[PDB]
Amino acid sequence: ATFKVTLINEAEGTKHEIEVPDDEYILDAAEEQGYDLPFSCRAGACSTCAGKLVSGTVDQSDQSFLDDDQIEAGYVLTCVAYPTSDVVIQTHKEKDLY
Numbered sequence: 223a224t225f226k227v228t229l230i231n232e233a234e235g236t237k238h239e240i241e242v243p244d245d246e247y248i249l250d251a252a253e254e255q256g257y258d259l260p261f262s263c264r265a266g267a268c269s270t271c272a273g274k275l276v277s278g279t280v281d282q283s284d285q286s287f288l289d290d291d292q293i294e295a296g297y298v299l300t301c302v303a304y305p306t307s308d309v310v311i312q313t314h315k316e317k318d319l320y
């Protein structure tokens with residue numbers, strides 16, 4: 223399957239839509255589609271690529287940085303997240319972390 227992923231940059235007031243394969247991480251699909259997003263480690267072990275879910279679900283089983291409460295709050299490391307449905311997510315949310 224292929225899921226629609228909506229990227230929202232609150233500070234910039236932008237909204238971009240991408241199509242993401244069920245077996246591709248969101249960050250990779252975004253870049254391929256023309257949208258560069260923040261990243262550093264690209265391995266699920268930092269917070270640079272953090273985003274926050276608005277709706278939809280992801281599989282980010284490979285991540286290691288976020289604690290359970292952060293995940294509960296809707297945080298996602300885009301570099302290692304696969305969409306599991308259509309998703310609405312806010313990007314550039316690193317600063318929200320502590």
Ligand code: FES
Nearest residue numbers: 263264266268301
């Ligand atoms: S860039 Fe480090 S966890 Fe995604």
